[PDB]
């Protein structure tokens, strides 16, 4: 994990110089992203269970994946899917608040594809649930907050 | 985990939970005055040298018994170098939202280095106090309201 | 650690014999090294910080190693170098007073080269600082005291 | 850490510091008379046997009720052996500058060994006292000034 | 430690039954061992130092093991051997009085062989001293008392 | 450490010493009459049931207000069961040489069990007194000299 502020302050410290105008400019527009990223992180942190419930209720439920033979049967596999989607939402919120997808790569998307292929987890259904998570977040967040969460959920989708 | 956002995310990740209201409160106070932070870091970068010589003059008035005031210009240049380096470390903390650029770069092992070099610590007391007073005259009322915790933190480490 | 007196008394005890004339002879010339080794250890123990300050001030300072990107930047790395040189001086003084470099091998020179290569510490600069430490000790100790400290600092240099 | 120099270095190393003035004072008093130590150890090695038989005669005069004075020559030879061994342990302490060759080799578990063997402890009292008196007659005034703490230490352990 | 009386009373209590005729019969012949085991334990408890002194004086002394380089040199190693043999005699007397070698296994013969191999203690000399301890006990105890102490010292020998 | 020999060995082992004369005196008094102990335990096993019904008759004469004397035969059978169990625990103590089979099995937590069951304690007073009197009539003069401390110990716990 490196966020946007550290990824600019650290090379200036290795150089021993101040933040030059390009890096301080790209930091400035991060600082006026700012309050909306914190507002989106506040909205997600209070209503995370509701977001995951709506994500499952429109992409995974009422089909054959929760019936016997499916990969969300029995309750243990449902609970595993539910905490997986909670991991995806929490680390996408971390990467959105940091404005940097590095925490998505060294905590989430590392061996995950091989884990799901070994386990038999349907990766297309996971990607479809993440696509529904974006639509759930679009109806609950603000406009550009939903777009940034969409970027950081597409990073998980492209890694999967 | 140098910046305040990365520390907030690291505290929330270690506890396997989302962002608590204390951490939202901390990031609210960091991002509300983030235009002032950019402006203050740009101003401290912009007239570093004006601050350094104007504080060196007041410091040599208030303390003439320094290794800088011994005639040879190269200890004087190393002192001016250190004043500029510590202003740079203050600007990093204004940008980061915490004094961790000042602790990790500037104050960790600083006392052992300066006692071995022979630079006295009351001399650095008064040097960073004069540097704070000059930068207070430079920045603003409210950009200095950001910088003055970090200048006080730097001063208190001597 | 085994010093000169124990390294002679112990094999005589395993044999159950007295100190024979060769070992008692090589102990005798250690005993008239003696007062000068204690005089050098007294001079070093009072002025150790001054010796380390002069060692750094003529081999490491006023260059690019203390500037950003150097390995004596920031202050934490300077403090680490300073306590490393204090370790080297203290264990060379121990090995000089003992007239035996065994305390240099099981306390100092064990994994140190691999530690410095892993850490990125410039070993040539360490060796050059130890060479300057010998010159600092030459100007502050007596004549053969400086030579014995030079031997016990060359043991660290050859181990590095 | 048998010799005094190794103990001084081990005490200074444990405290992560250089050699304090008490330890320089101890090594000054050890190395100033180190020619006498070599001479005394060489003299104790050189006429061990003269000391052992001349002390055995005085000890059998002062204590005839010994296991040595029971006719058979082999307990007598083991007693002469022990007298020579303890003179060797005294010479090691003269060389080492401390009584740690006498404690680690000679006196640790000595009482259990001699009570199991059946050798009485007042007999060893007077045997090492006579051995000290003979070695005082042998060595010098001032080489014996080195040996007499260790002979007293040996005597006091019985 | 379980002795002969407890090793019969305890399974009768787990069964909830009386001591049946086989167990009560094997307890009866223990009860007329009895007074001789107590007589042997009285003889050993008063003259234990004499037994250990005679054991050392006929198996370990007057050789190279008590001379320098031996494992009964210096006095500390002699004292350690002496208290080891006192342990062996005391726990063999306990196991004889109990008529059960279980106290020899969970107090004496557990890691002892590995302890002696690590320490460099000559196990053959220990076994030879225990063989001499049996001969010392034969000349001081009664006839079958010596035989039972021989059994319980052979248990230590076989464990070593 | 239930039997007397194991307790003697455990007391001597805890003090890192051999068997003291008090412990030899205790094991002398245990092993001298150990033929009587085997005979008494065999006799108590051999006619347990004779003792139990002959004591139950005397106990129902001396105390008719028992849970046993209430008509239903199954509380009566549990009482006969307990009388036989306590005779078995007495025989274990005759064999062990101490009342530790009676304390560990029979009397530890006995009062809480019987007060919860509703069995009165004077009823058990007189039941074990009648059981002692019948077993005194059964055993001997001198086998009962062994059993009567343990029967008294059982009686005194009610
Ligand atoms: C729901 C989206 C789909 C699904 C999910 C499912 N996942 C698993 C088991 C595992 N899930 C992970 C993923 C992670 N662990 C982490 O720490 C992180 C990052 C913070 C991630 C992303 C792993 C490693 C496993 C294997 C180990 C484990 O089970 O804990 C399962 C269980 C598989 C099983 O056989 O039980 C399931 C069911 N499956 C679907 O069908 C949904 C579409
Ligand atoms: C001036 C305000 C005061 C003082 C300064 C002085 N400094 C030096 C020499 C050195 N100073 C440093 C400083 C730093 N290294 C770091 O990593 C950081 C934090 C980022 C700092 C501030 C170093 C490394 C040196 C060594 C020389 C070199 O850089 O190569 C001196 C010279 C002392 C000497 O013996 O040469 C002086 C005089 N002197 C004053 O009077 C003021 C109190
Ligand atoms: C100064 C001579 C040069 C230099 C030094 C430097 N060393 C380190 C870090 C370590 N130094 C040691 C050495 C020892 N530890 C001991 O206990 C002993 C014997 C008593 C010795 C000799 C070790 C083990 C480390 C690693 C663990 C630690 O940091 O404490 C550093 C720090 C490296 C870092 O990344 O912080 C430095 C800077 N480097 C130079 O450039 C000088 C030439
Ligand atoms: C003579 C001064 C006195 C005395 C001596 C005596 N000694 C022994 C037997 C032994 N003595 C030793 C001694 C030592 N072992 C050590 O490690 C050290 C210190 C380095 C010492 C001094 C030992 C091991 C023995 C056992 C025999 C052997 O060596 O193999 C005896 C014999 C006793 C016996 O039962 O055999 C005697 C008589 N007797 C006197 O009268 C003097 C007081
Ligand atoms: C004499 C028979 C031989 C001999 C003995 C010897 N043993 C040791 C050291 C140890 N002995 C033990 C044994 C026990 N400790 C217990 O508590 C018990 C049971 C009650 C036993 C049996 C142990 C554990 C040790 C190691 C720890 C310690 O020293 O206390 C030594 C000392 C070895 C040393 O280096 O000092 C010796 C000499 N050696 C011989 O040559 C005799 C044949
Ligand atoms: C008869 C002498 C007296 C008495 C007896 C009575 N006992 C019970 C019921 C139980 N008694 C026990 C007894 C023991 N458990 C132990 O561990 C021991 C020591 C080894 C003893 C003595 C237990 C466990 C019970 C519970 C029933 C069961 O065993 O499953 C009763 C029945 C009480 C009830 O409510 O059922 C009675 C009547 N009654 C008398 O009148 C005499 C004084
Ligand atoms: Cl789970
Ligand atoms: Cl350090
Ligand atoms: Cl011991």
Numbering used by the authors:
A (entry chain F), C (entry chain D), E (entry chain B): 1 to 160
B (entry chain E), D (entry chain C), F (entry chain A): 27 to 184
Provide the authors' own sentences about this structure as they appear in the paper.
To compete in certain low-light environments, some cyanobacteria express a paralog of the light-harvesting phycobiliprotein, allophycocyanin (AP), that strongly absorbs far-red light (FRL). The FRL-AP expressed during LoLiP is composed of an α-subunit, ApcD4, and a β-subunit, ApcB3, each of which binds a single PCB. Despite binding the same phycocyanobilin (PCB) chromophore as conventional AP (λmax = 650 nm) and the PBS terminal emitter, AP-B (λmax = 670 nm), the absorbance maximum of the FRL-absorbing AP expressed during LoLiP is bathochromically shifted by ~40 to 60 nm to ~710 nm. Instead, FRL-AP is membrane-associated and copurifies after detergent solubilization with IsiX, which suggests the existence of a unique antenna complex specialized for harvesting FRL.
Using cryo–electron microscopy and time-resolved absorption spectroscopy, we reveal the structure-function relationship of this FRL-absorbing AP complex (FRL-AP) that is expressed during acclimation to low light and that likely associates with chlorophyll a–containing photosystem I. FRL-AP assembles as helical nanotubes rather than typical toroids due to alterations of the domain geometry within each subunit. Each (αβ) protomer binds two PCBs (one per subunit), one anion tentatively modeled as Cl− and 110 water molecules. Each repeating helical unit of FRL-AP comprises seven protomers that span 720° over 72.6 Å. Consequently, the α- and β-subunits of FRL-AP form an angle of ~135° in the xy plane, whereas the corresponding angle in the structures of other AP-family representatives is ~120°, and there is a slight separation along the z axis, ~10° (bottom left). Superimposing the individual α- and β-subunits of FRL-AP onto the corresponding subunits from other AP-family representatives (i.e., AP and AP-B) reveals that the XY domain of each subunit is positioned differently in FRL-AP, which is the cause of the more open configuration that results in helix formation. In the α-subunit, the entire XY domain is rotated ~16°, relative to the globin domain. In the β-subunit, helix X and the XY loop are substantially shifted, ~21°. In the helical configuration, an α-subunit does not interact with any other α-subunit, but it interacts with three β-subunits: that of its own protomer, that of the prior protomer in the helix, and that of the protomer in the helical level below it. The closest edge-to-edge distance, ~12 Å, for PCBs in the helical FRL-AP complex occurs between an α-PCB and the β-PCB of the nearest adjacent protomer.
